[PDB]
A paper describes a structure:
[name] (DHFR) is a key and essential enzyme in the folate pathway that converts dihydrofolate (DHF) to tetrahydrofolate (THF). This coenzyme is required for a variety of cellular processes, including the synthesis of purine involved in nucleic acid and amino-acid biosynthesis. The active site is located in a cleft formed by α-helix 1, α-helix 2, α-helix 4 and β-sheet 1, similar to CglDHFR and CalDHFR. As classified in E. coli DHFR, CauDHFR could also be designated to have two subdomains: the nucleotide subdomain, in which the NADPH sits, and the substrate-binding subdomain, which is predominantly formed by α-helix 1, α-helix 2 and β-sheet 1.
Crystals of apo and holo CauDHFR have a single protomer in the asymmetric unit, while the ternary complexes CauDHFR–NADPH–PYR and CauDHFR–NADPH–CYG contained two protein molecules which are independent and do not form a quaternary structure, according to the PISA server. In order to obtain the structures of the CauDHFR–NADPH–PYR and CauDHFR–NADPH–CYG ternary complexes, the N-terminal His tag of the protein needed to be removed since analysis of the crystal packing of the CauDHFR–NADPH complex showed that the N-terminus of the adjacent symmetric protomer extends into the substrate-binding site, blocking ligand access. The NADPH binding site is located in a very positively charged cleft between α-helix 2 and α-helix 4, in which the cofactor is involved in an extensive number of hydrogen-bonding interactions. The diphosphate groups interact with both α-helix 2 and α-helix 4, specifically with Gly54, Thr57, Gly122, Ser123 and Gln124. The adenine group interacts with Leu76, Ser77, Arg78 and Leu128 between α-helix 3 and α-helix 4, which is the most solvent-exposed moiety of NADPH. The ribose ring makes interactions with Ile19, Gly23 and Ser24 from the substrate-binding domain, which is the most neutral region of the cofactor-binding site. The nicotinamide moiety is buried in the active site of the enzyme, interacting with Ala11, Ile19, Leu25 and Tyr126, extending further towards the substrate-binding subdomain.
Author numbering: -9 to 202
The structure:
């Protein structure tokens, strides 16, 4: 935080991550309004990563309206995190549980900046964009996104049984560069398994990318 020297701001400005699982090779991120894989350890990774903040800080999760509707009521808002829901019909309100119902990523970022990136008298550490496909494909083009946390998902059943995806991440690889595993662990603040994790007909690898 602040020091007697007067040289440091109270907190660093929060990094923005887009966290997503994408099917190889064509970056499929949805099928028929859902997702064809259900990976228990990957869902735990999402919980652990989005919840892990440096001491005295909290993280934010930013999601589209349709994804908010698919979180079970008893688990909303996602505990231990600033929840932001995007809908163009929202009225830019912060409700009785501290949930931000905002009309655009621009509007919520403007508000957070006005508040010195603080919430419930906690500074923000990381802001995670958590989906769904429409919000991912809008915000992956936003210059404020600092990194991608991509779970690379591989189908390892028979070729004919691979799920047919119908929504894909608008990810231009020329704009991004994969980092080594130590950088991923240092960013997320956790010990993360390296390599291909196995569950059923899928394997999956945790990766991090920054801008080229
Ligand atoms: N691969 C992965 O890791 C993940 C994939 N998914 C997949 O995502 C899919 C669902 O995603 P989707 O249906 O696209 O729903 P989203 O969660 O992306 O929410 C879509 C809604 O966001 C609002 N919206 C759209 N553009 C804007 C904007 N510019 N500013 C503000 N609000 C906006 C709209 O509601 P309004 O009209 O009210 O503005 C729209 O209906 C499912 O297939 C799910 O499995 C979800 C999570 C993780």
């Amino acid at each position: 935080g602040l020091v007697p020297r007067g040289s440091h701001m109270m907190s660093t400005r929060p990094k923005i991550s887009l966290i997503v699982a994408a099917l190889q090779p064509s970056m499929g991120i949805g099928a028929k309004g859902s997702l064809p894989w259900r990976l228990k350890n990957e869902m735990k990774y999402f919980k652990d990563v989005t919840s892990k903040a440096k001491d005295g800080h909290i993280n934010a999760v930013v999601m589209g309206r349709k994804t908010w509707e698919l979180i079970p009521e008893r688990f909303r808002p996602l505990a231990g995190r600033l929840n932001v829901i995007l809908s163009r019909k929202n009225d830019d309100l912060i409700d009785s549980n501290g949930v931000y119902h905002f009309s655009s990523f621009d509007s919520v970022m403007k508000h957070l900046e006005k508040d010195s990136f603080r919430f419930k008298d906690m500074p923000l550490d990381k802001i995670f964009i958590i989906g769904g496909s429409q919000i991912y494909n809008l915000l992956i083009l936003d210059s404020r996104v600092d990194n991608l946390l991509v779970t690379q998902v591989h189908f390892v059943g028979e070729d004919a049984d691979k799920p047919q995806m119908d929504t894909f991440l608008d990810w231009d690889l020329s704009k991004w560069k994969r980092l080594e595993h130590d950088k991923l662990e240092q960013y997320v603040g956790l010990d993360v398994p390296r390599g291909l994790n196995e569950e059923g007909s899928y394997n999956y690898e945790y990766t991090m990318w920054e801008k080229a």
